[PDB]
């Protein structure tokens, strides 16, 4: 029913901050999950995939900064670590779901600011 | 390579009670694997129509996909007061996925 | 085809007695909007028809979402009309580079208006003028009355929703007749085999044999009404089945 | 066109006896020396049959007699003839001789058989006219003296001509030919021979085997029918028409059981009818 | 696309004279058809419609003089008979057609004389 | 009776660049069924404006129509030197049809 994100802030370039993101209402469990980046009047662009019910993971090829992505399927959670950073990476990120023809489970999170700067 | 997006047109300021036309094209064929979206700039992307022939719960007929292959229609008719937002359209053909642009429906 | 007709006169083509080359029509994939129903794309493959109607038509890139089985707008509502019920694949694709032309393409045209809307396949080449107010024109134009057909414009400096869809469809039946229109291994010698000849199935041993049909023969048989002898239909020859 | 012409002929159908007739072969499967026994639509062995001349030539002088009836199909039909000088081209089989029924219009076209399942308009008195086109001394036909409207069609088909000539015998062979036409199970199946016969008209005491030539997806049920015809015209004598002579065989199929003796080599000789005495 | 006129020349009064009009590049069949008049000097005045679609004819009452207006459907033709002839009628005709706010269809024929006099 | 039109002025004589208002006026009031034509002196009439408020193809917009009902307004705008000939509007509205006398364009 519901997505909660971890905390926004202002990284300096170069470093890493995890992602978490818990669900509520139904489980990630049987379902997968996904990221994508909202900058600041630009359109929508998908970032990664999580598939559980495997295991296996998928990148965007666009934004390839090993942005690591895997589970706590017991809290119904999901982590990304922002790895590798640069500056027009300063967004917002929203945990996705993509309704593939037969489900309509796509749930939005609350959206967090992930800011690339030197600059605090 | 990737599969490149054609949302057109990428803004289009509209009226009351039109019936406005969002195409997303494709450069590849694509079944049906197409989405739309609402989003008032700020929001969660809220979903309108899945495999791009099909409505959703809570969004009444006034929006209305179809298309296949290449070409894909974003059918909004009879245009609300409230239906003037940022809108999207959704491949999940392959790997890696990719979103239109936007077209961002707006009052005249 | 090199010159389809427009949408008010659009081109028929029963087809049966025949065979269906379906590989090749997803292996074209230079088609913008391509769907099917009645069962699967995949599935019709072999799913075959009795009796087929080819007819195809020129519209435009914007309205080529009206041409769908049970919708509105003007093609499906005045030029050509799926009905409530069908079956077959509608087949589009974009043909910019011959249609439209510069100095303008107006050889196409289409209806506008009609007192009803259209029943289901038919066109409509009845050119008069339809009266909507009540002031009687009487074939000629005049006030309350316009024109019944209108072209399209058609140049290649339009936008790609303004590009014209040579549209043909396909539409699909059954019936007490045959399936007259239908769609299509290594052979094994001197070794055990399961076997399809021509639907005949069975397990044998397929050897070389001598016995000598008259031609228009398929099987062979023994005493016991078993399927003694078969021939090779793709190269003709007389094969055992023990 | 719908030319018609009537004439003043009505009289006793003259009779026959087939005696071992219209045995062909009711399957593909191949056969050697076994006794095979099948119940089936056949013509049975020493039953009536119809000779018809289409033109007949009574003499005084001239008097050509044009008689074909259109003919119902009944259960199954049966054609022979001669016809040393083909008259004769085809058969208008269908149910209402007009629309609303599809039509049967095997027409040979003196080329290569075109076989149409159509719907057509057959005129009162149809048959094939034939004319002299004046280019390269050729005899085209007028195929709309048979009927007016070609519309609908349901099907087509071309194959090589089952009417065949060889001639050059001055007679002695006649060249027999017969023709099977079952409609069945949506597949009306055409059956052809050709023969020798060195007497005077009617058949002889041998076996005569068919197969089958097409079987085709048709459909529809054809209840009556008529010959098709070959005519031309003729300059100032003392519009012309009713070319030399013409008279054919025809007998109803029934359901019989028949004892299929098949040859080493595939070829049925001997049949017997069980329900004949 | 084009439209080609029968002969003008020099009639008697009172006289006939059958007026043909052939098109090209598109038919006549599905139109109408118009004649209009030139006089030198003065300027175009409507003379007669046809109307193939079902079958009408209408004259102008201002010059009406039985000018009969008929078909050639199958040649892309039309034949309109100069009758019951006057003098002031010498003048170009045209073979015309109107947009009526529907189509683009106006085309106009090469023009050719008419001319009523006793003296050739 | 007939339908009157009335053509004013039935000529003016102008310069280069000019803008001028050939008006046609009716009698009755016709909706929009109102042309305009190009002839110099012995070619075919050039349709101009189709239902009053039309452009036409090889008709750039130095011509522009507007008017309904009794008037009706030829917009001639940046007047070229091959405009200069004899224009005329028409009414389609009933049967019959009448032309207006005629308005030359000439140079000055
Ligand atoms: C064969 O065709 C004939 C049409 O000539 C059909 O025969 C008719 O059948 C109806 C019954 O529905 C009878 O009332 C008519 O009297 C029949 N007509 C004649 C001339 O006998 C018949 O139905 C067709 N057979 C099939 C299987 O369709």
Redesign the interface.
Known sequence: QQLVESGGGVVQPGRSLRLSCAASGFTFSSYAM?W?RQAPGK????VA?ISYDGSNK?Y???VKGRFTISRDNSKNTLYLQMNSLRAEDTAVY?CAR????MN?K?I????TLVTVSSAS | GDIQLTQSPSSLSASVGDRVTITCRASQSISSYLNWYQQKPGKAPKLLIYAASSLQSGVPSRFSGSGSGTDFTLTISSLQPEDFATYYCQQSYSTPRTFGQGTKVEIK | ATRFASVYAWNRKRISNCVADYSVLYNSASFSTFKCYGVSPTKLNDLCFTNVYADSFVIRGDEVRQIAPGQTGKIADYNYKLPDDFTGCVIAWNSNNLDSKVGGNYNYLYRLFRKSNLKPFERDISTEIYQAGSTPCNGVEGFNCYFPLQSYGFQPTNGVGYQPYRVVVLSFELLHAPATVCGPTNLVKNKCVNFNFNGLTGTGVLTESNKKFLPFQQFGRDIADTTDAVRDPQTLEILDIT | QCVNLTTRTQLPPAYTNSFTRGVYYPDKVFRSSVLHSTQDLFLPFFSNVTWFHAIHVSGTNGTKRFDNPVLPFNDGVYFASTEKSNIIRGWIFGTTLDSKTQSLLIVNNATNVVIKVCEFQFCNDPFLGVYYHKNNKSWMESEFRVYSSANNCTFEYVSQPFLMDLEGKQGNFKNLREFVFKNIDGYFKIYSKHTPINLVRDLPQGFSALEPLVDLPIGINITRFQTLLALHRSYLTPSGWTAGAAAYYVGYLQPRTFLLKYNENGTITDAVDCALD
Do not use: F, R
């Open positions: 996904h994508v359109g929508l662009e998908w995939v998928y965007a090829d666009s929203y993509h309704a593939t023809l309509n796509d939005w999170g609350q959206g």
